[PDB]
Amino acid sequence: EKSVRIGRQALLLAMLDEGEEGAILDELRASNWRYCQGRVGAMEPQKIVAAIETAAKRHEVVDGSLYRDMHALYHAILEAVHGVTRGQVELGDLLRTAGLRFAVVRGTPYEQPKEGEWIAVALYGTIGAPVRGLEHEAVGLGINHI
Amino acid sequence: EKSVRIGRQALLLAMLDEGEEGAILDELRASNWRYCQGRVGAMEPQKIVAAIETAAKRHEVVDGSLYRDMHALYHAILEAVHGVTRGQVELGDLLRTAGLRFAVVRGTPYEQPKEGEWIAVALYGTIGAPVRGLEHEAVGLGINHI
Amino acid sequence: EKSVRIGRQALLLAMLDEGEEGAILDELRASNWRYCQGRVGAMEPQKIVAAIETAAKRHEVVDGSLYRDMHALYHAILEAVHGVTRGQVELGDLLRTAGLRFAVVRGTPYEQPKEGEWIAVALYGTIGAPVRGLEHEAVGLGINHI
Amino acid sequence: EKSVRIGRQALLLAMLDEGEEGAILDELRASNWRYCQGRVGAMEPQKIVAAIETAAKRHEVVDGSLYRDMHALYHAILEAVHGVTRGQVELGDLLRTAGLRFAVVRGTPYEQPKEGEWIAVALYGTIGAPVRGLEHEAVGLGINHI
Amino acid sequence: EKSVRIGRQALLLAMLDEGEEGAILDELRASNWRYCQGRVGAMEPQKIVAAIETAAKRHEVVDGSLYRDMHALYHAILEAVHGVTRGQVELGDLLRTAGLRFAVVRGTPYEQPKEGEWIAVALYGTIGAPVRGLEHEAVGLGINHI
Amino acid sequence: EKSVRIGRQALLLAMLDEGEEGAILDELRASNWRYCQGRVGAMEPQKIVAAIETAAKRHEVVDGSLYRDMHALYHAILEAVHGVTRGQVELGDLLRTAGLRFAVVRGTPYEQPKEGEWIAVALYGTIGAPVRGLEHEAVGLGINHI
Numbered sequence: 001e002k003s004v005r006i007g008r009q010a011l012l013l014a015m016l017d018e019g020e021e022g023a024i025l026d027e028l029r030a031s032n033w034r035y036c037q038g039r040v041g042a043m044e045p046q047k048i049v050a051a052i053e054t055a056a057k058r059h060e061v062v063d064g065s066l067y068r069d070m071h072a073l074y075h076a077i078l079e080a081v082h083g084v085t086r087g088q089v090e091l092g093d094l095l096r097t098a099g100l101r102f103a104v105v106r107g108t109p110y111e112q113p114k115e116g117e118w119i120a121v122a123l124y125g126t127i128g129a130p131v132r133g134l135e136h137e138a139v140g141l142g143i144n145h146i
Numbered sequence: 147e148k149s150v151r152i153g154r155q156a157l158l159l160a161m162l163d164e165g166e167e168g169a170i171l172d173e174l175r176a177s178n179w180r181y182c183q184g185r186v187g188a189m190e191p192q193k194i195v196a197a198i199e200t201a202a203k204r205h206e207v208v209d210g211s212l213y214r215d216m217h218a219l220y221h222a223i224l225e226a227v228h229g230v231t232r233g234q235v236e237l238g239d240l241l242r243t244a245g246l247r248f249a250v251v252r253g254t255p256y257e258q259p260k261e262g263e264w265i266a267v268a269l270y271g272t273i274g275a276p277v278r279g280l281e282h283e284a285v286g287l288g289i290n291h292i
Numbered sequence: 293e294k295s296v297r298i299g300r301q302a303l304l305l306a307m308l309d310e311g312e313e314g315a316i317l318d319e320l321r322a323s324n325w326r327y328c329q330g331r332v333g334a335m336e337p338q339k340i341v342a343a344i345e346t347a348a349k350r351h352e353v354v355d356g357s358l359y360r361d362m363h364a365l366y367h368a369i370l371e372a373v374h375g376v377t378r379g380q381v382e383l384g385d386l387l388r389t390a391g392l393r394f395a396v397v398r399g400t401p402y403e404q405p406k407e408g409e410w411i412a413v414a415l416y417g418t419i420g421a422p423v424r425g426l427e428h429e430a431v432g433l434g435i436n437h438i
Numbered sequence: 439e440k441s442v443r444i445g446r447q448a449l450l451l452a453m454l455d456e457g458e459e460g461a462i463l464d465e466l467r468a469s470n471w472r473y474c475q476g477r478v479g480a481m482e483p484q485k486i487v488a489a490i491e492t493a494a495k496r497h498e499v500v501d502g503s504l505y506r507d508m509h510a511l512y513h514a515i516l517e518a519v520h521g522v523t524r525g526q527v528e529l530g531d532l533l534r535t536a537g538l539r540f541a542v543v544r545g546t547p548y549e550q551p552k553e554g555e556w557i558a559v560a561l562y563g564t565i566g567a568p569v570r571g572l573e574h575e576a577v578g579l580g581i582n583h584i
Numbered sequence: 585e586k587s588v589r590i591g592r593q594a595l596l597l598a599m600l601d602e603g604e605e606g607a608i609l610d611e612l613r614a615s616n617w618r619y620c621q622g623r624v625g626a627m628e629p630q631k632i633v634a635a636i637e638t639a640a641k642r643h644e645v646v647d648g649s650l651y652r653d654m655h656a657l658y659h660a661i662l663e664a665v666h667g668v669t670r671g672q673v674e675l676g677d678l679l680r681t682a683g684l685r686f687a688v689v690r691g692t693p694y695e696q697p698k699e700g701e702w703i704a705v706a707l708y709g710t711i712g713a714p715v716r717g718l719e720h721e722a723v724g725l726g727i728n729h730i
Numbered sequence: 731e732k733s734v735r736i737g738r739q740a741l742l743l744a745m746l747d748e749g750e751e752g753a754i755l756d757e758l759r760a761s762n763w764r765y766c767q768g769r770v771g772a773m774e775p776q777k778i779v780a781a782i783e784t785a786a787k788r789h790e791v792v793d794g795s796l797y798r799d800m801h802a803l804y805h806a807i808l809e810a811v812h813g814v815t816r817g818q819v820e821l822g823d824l825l826r827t828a829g830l831r832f833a834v835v836r837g838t839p840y841e842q843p844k845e846g847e848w849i850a851v852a853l854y855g856t857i858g859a860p861v862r863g864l865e866h867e868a869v870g871l872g873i874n875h876i
């Protein structure tokens with residue numbers, strides 16, 4: 001009964017370049033956890049939330065018709081987005097835009113089997129002015145029971 | 147095209163297990179950037195801030211007597227801590243505690259040399275109740291010009 | 293010189309089903325306090341604020357032309373809406389919508405007659421995804437002197 | 439149609455005077471849901487959180503050794519406390535104190551059985567200066583899946 | 585047209601050097617408004633709030649035994665303090681300290697007499713690390729009806 | 731090596747009537763600091779941010795093409811706007827609008843020449859309902875190294 005850093009897995013999927021994330025994809029392949037990865041460019045924060053919801057449903061990480069799944073996920077997304085905005089969640093209303101990669105991981109990270117499933121949402125990318133090149137990095141992670 | 151993800155380097159230092167970080171430590175040597183790593187266990191947020199300020203100074207990443215350096219670092223730390231707390235920056239006052247790794251990296255990551263120096267502060271850890279095992283992961287990143 | 297739970301009156305008007313709130317309507321009828329009740333469905337928070345302002349003016353709880361009345365009320369509304377959003381006041385920008393009942397009560401709740409008038413704004417309903425059934429409950433209360 | 443307003447039950451327990459709550463206590467018996475009530479006087483927010491965690495555990499509403507239960511409850515408590523503080527969760531640090539009743543209710547309130555269990559935490563009280571009589575009402579509600 | 589910028593008067597009292605404020609002190613005499621000034625050094629925010637409450641009472645700007653007066657003043661103080669902290673109201677808990685001047689002015693600044701009395705609270709100072717010289721300026725203003 | 735209250739200079743430019751700010755304009759003329767003044771009426775906060783950015787670039791206080799300058803300024807603007815909104819930065823989404831004067835000052839306020847440049851953003855005006863006359867005053871100040 002080993003414990004796993006599910007959040008760090010999600011983050012690595014969001015921040016490692018393609019073909020560097022091989023070992024993560026294999027760990028998740030082994031323990032048979034559901035996950036998805038995606039990208040979103042946004043000036044409205046709801047577009048982030050919807051992108052992640054669209055991806056998680058699409059790759060069967062969560063069931064769009066089951067509120068407990070969607071409630072779990074929604075709260076994780078909002079925690080992740082707070083990491084990126086480092087305060088109030090605003091993009092366009094504060095004249096900034098973000099370009100982000102995301103990952104979502106659903107699994108059983110705890111040693112005790114009774115801890116059940118947990119979900120992780122990671123974000124990594126840039127935030128900046130609406131003009132290319134006037135930006136820096138940002139990150140977030142959200143965790144919730146599911 | 148010559149730009150570097152300084153934040154991702156800092157986050158990788160904070161999150162990769164000791165002994166997995168060699169290629170990040172090598173890149174930093176080649177560019178001759180200053181950096182440091184550390185760990186802090188805290189039930190009060192000022193202990194995080196003091197720990198990272200203490201580390202950065204003692205490793206000569208910043209000059210503790212120069213306000214522009216300490217001003218730049220302080221704001222980057224608060225940004226990183228927001229990512230960890232996902233809302234109001236509180237630990238003990240909301241009955242939670244954190245165990246965090248951190249890293250600080252300063253160099254010049256943009257192509258244009260006029261962009262000068264920037265500093266990244268990354269936190270990766272757990273947060274939870276003050277009871278062993280009742281915790282989950284958290285992450286944060288702050289960036290500032292310096 | 294009895295004291296009255298004006299906030300709890302407002303809340304009961306917002307959360308009790310119709311025909312259950314009889315005794316509240318009679319207490320308010322007795323002490324001759326002004327009040328109003330209403331409903332709003334919204335994806336933009338300003339639509340909540342405007343609905344409540346429209347109702348309070350309409351039922352003569354406040355004077356639309358007197359800023360001290362409208363300043364009193366506005367601040368109470370925003371406190372109530374914070375209860376509902378449990379953090380940043382966002383609906384649509386965070387991909388959620390709310391369906392709420394409200395009540396506003398204006399009166400003299402304190403024992404001392406010199407405490408003058410006070411106003412209460414209560415909200416109760418659901419918040420959720422923009423899709424019906426994927427929602428749970430929410431509440432708020434705001435109090436201010438007037 | 440079979441759904442229940444679990445939050446409204448919790449709020450009614452918290453706010454109705456002792457002896458007025460019988461029909462709420464009866465509904466809860468018929469559905470066989472777990473629940474508890476309590477009171478806390480506090481000048482620090484962690485005392486609220488500790489009080490409700492202590493109560494829920496000691497009445498077997500949650501399992502203090504199971505993180506998914508304590509994780510679900512903790513987030514519901516912070517949501518309820520936001521409603522009380524109407525902004526930053528502070529008491530003593532902003533020179534205020536609170537006297538609150540609380541209730542926690544867990545059962546399954548949705549029609550579809552797959553929605554499983556949810557927990558409500560409700561706070562109703564006063565908040566004010568640390569001087570007798572310089573206070574007004576406050577309320578909060580938090581809901582989470584569990 | 586007869587309106588007065590009561591907040592600007594309060595801010596000018598707080599920020600102008602002693603001996604530069606005479607014309608503001610004169611305007612206040614002519615209108616016979618109540619007011620007070622003061623200084624507070626603090627590492628905890630409640631010390632600000634207590635200091636301004638203490639000053640207002642002891643100079644008879646407000647009646648410490650009347651809740652409507654203390655309620656009006658308290659909210660104006662928290663607003664002013666938000667301007668100083670530029671986010672979460674924290675000093676010591678985020679490893680910073682402040683040295684502030686304040687002023688409180690109450691009179692009736694609107695044209696229409698029905699608008700009655702209003703109170704302004706202004707803070708002007710520095711905030712910084714608890715080390716001499718590692719600081720910069722900050723300001724705040726709060727207004728409320730009273 | 732004298733120290734200068736650069737923030738208080740910016741604030742005075744934002745709050746003093748025209749022809750009253752003479753001595754400030756002369757001090758800045760003497761030390762040869764860059765600055766600009768402006769006005770903005772807005773119901774969307776990004777319109778404030780853009781107005782100030784447009785003015786600062788236009789009067790050569792900052793270089794629009796240099797991210798370190800624009801990053802410095804952006805953060806100062808957001809600190810200033812927090813002073814005005816006294817919490818969450820919202821105007822129209824919370825059914826309020828603002829009419830503001832601003833000033834931006836860039837200079838070398840510290841005694842030590844190694845402290846380099848710093849920038850100040852001040853705001854002063856009114857915030858209120860979208861209807862004229864139902865408003866009161868607001869202020870903010872942001873400081874950052876540059």
Ligand SMILES: N[C@@H](Cc1c[nH]c[nH+]1)C(=O)O
Pocket residue numbers: 085095096097127128129130134135136800801804
């Ligand atoms: N630096 C901002 C983003 C930005 C807006 N404009 C320029 N940069 C941030 O930390 O989010």
Ligand SMILES: N[C@@H](Cc1c[nH]c[nH+]1)C(=O)O
Pocket residue numbers: 231241242243273274275276280281508509512
């Ligand atoms: N889950 C909390 C931490 C915690 C407090 N108590 C139990 N857990 C968080 O997300 O920060």
Ligand SMILES: N[C@@H](Cc1c[nH]c[nH+]1)C(=O)O
Pocket residue numbers: 070071074377387388389419420421422426427428
């Ligand atoms: N559960 C969210 C609302 C929601 C959005 N999407 C799904 N649910 C809240 O607490 O406000």
Ligand SMILES: N[C@@H](Cc1c[nH]c[nH+]1)C(=O)O
Pocket residue numbers: 523533534535565566567568572573654655658
């Ligand atoms: N009125 C404050 C409580 C308070 C503090 N001091 C006086 N009253 C609030 O709304 O939370």
Ligand SMILES: N[C@@H](Cc1c[nH]c[nH+]1)C(=O)O
Pocket residue numbers: 216217220669679680681711712713714718719
């Ligand atoms: N610069 C901080 C104050 C500070 C803390 N440590 C150093 N400086 C602020 O803007 O509030």
Ligand SMILES: N[C@@H](Cc1c[nH]c[nH+]1)C(=O)O
Pocket residue numbers: 362363366815825826827857858859860864865866
């Ligand atoms: N009084 C509000 C502004 C307002 C909105 N509506 C009426 N007034 C504030 O402090 O920001």
Ligand SMILES: [Mg+2]
Pocket residue numbers: 071075428581
């Ligand atoms: Mg929810």
Ligand SMILES: [Mg+2]
Pocket residue numbers: 217221720873
């Ligand atoms: Mg600063």
Ligand SMILES: [Mg+2]
Pocket residue numbers: 235236239527528531673674677
């Ligand atoms: Mg605090």
Ligand SMILES: [Mg+2]
Pocket residue numbers: 239531677
């Ligand atoms: Mg504290």
Ligand SMILES: [Mg+2]
Pocket residue numbers: 363367727866
């Ligand atoms: Mg106001």
Ligand SMILES: [Mg+2]
Pocket residue numbers: 089090093381382385819820823
């Ligand atoms: Mg918004």
Ligand SMILES: [Mg+2]
Pocket residue numbers: 093385823
């Ligand atoms: Mg918006």
Ligand SMILES: [Mg+2]
Pocket residue numbers: 143282509513
């Ligand atoms: Mg959690």
Ligand SMILES: [Mg+2]
Pocket residue numbers: 435574655659
């Ligand atoms: Mg109050």
Ligand SMILES: [Mg+2]
Pocket residue numbers: 136289801805
């Ligand atoms: Mg930035």
